[PDB]
């Protein structure tokens, strides 16, 4: 969800995903395909979906994290007078970046918990499975 202390406001720009395209901490992984912004609550949503479907307990790695403050001006104001005041928080997930890692669950379980998380997501995704030893 939120960061704890910071600077306040920000900006916007894009190209392909820095690190990391590879599958650590787990056996199955879910990957972006589109240059989105991702809000806390959207992740929160995926977290709760997958957490329920796994029941107790599995193991869930939420790689992505919202450090980026997005603002929205008040209702019905003429432009200017200031910058909008922190509406919510996004995490700038670029394509190929791995958003999710789950392990301690079968392939089937992983597929499903993934698909369920996917339908809650602003962007297309793909699941995959290890071999990406660029390092470890």
Partner RNA sequence: GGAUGUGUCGUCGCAUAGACAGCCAGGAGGUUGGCUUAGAAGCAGCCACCCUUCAAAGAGUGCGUAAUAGCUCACUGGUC
Residue ranges binding RNA (CB under 7 A): 55-56, 118-119, 124
Which C-beta is closer to other proteins: that of 82 or that of 122?
122
DSSP letter for each residue of 84-97: ----EEEE---TT-
Q: How far is the CB of 21 from other proteins (least distance, A)?
A: 4
Which C-beta is closer to RNA: that of 31 or that of 69?
31
Task: With H, G, I as helix, E, B as strand and everything else as coil, classify residue 98.
Answer: strand
Which C-beta is closer to RNA: that of 34 or that of 67?
34
Distance of alpha carbon 121 from alpha carbon 99, whole angstroms: 11
Distance of alpha carbon 120 from alpha carbon 101, whole angstroms: 16
Q: Where are the beta strands (DSSP E) in the chain?
A: 28-32, 38-39, 59-62, 68-70, 88-91, 98-103, 125-128
Residue 70 touches which member of other proteins, RNA, none, C-beta under 5-8 Å by kind = none
Angle at 127 between CA 13 and CA 19, to 5 degrees: 40
Q: How far is the CB of 9 from RNA (least distance, A)?
A: 32
Residue 24 touches which member of other proteins, RNA, none, C-beta under 5-8 Å by kind = other proteins
Q: Which residues bind other proteins (CB under 8 A)?
A: 16-17, 21, 24, 31, 33, 56-59, 95-96, 103-104, 126, 128, 130-134, 136
Q: How far is the CB of 17 from other proteins (least distance, A)?
A: 6
Task: With H, G, I as helix, E, B as strand and everything else as coil, classify residue 70.
Answer: strand
Q: How far is the CB of 39 from other proteins (least distance, A)?
A: 23
């Amino acid at each position: 969800k939120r960061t704890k202390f910071r600077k306040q406001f920000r900006g916007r720009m894009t190209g392909d995903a820095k690190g990391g395209d590879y599958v650590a901490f787990g056996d199955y992984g879910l990957i972006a395909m589109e240059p989105a912004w991702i809000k806390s609550n959207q992740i929160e949503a995926c977290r709760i979906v997958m957490s329920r479907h796994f029941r107790r307990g599995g193991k869930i790695y939420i790689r992505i994290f919202p450090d980026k403050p997005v603002t929205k001006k008040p209702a019905e104001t003429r432009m200017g007078k200031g910058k909008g005041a922190v509406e919510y928080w996004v995490s700038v997930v670029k394509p190929g970046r791995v958003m999710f890692e789950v392990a301690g669950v079968t392939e089937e379980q992983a597929k499903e918990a993934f698909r369920l998380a996917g339908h809650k997501l602003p962007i297309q995704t793909k699941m995959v499975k290890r071999e990406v030893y660029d390092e470890a």
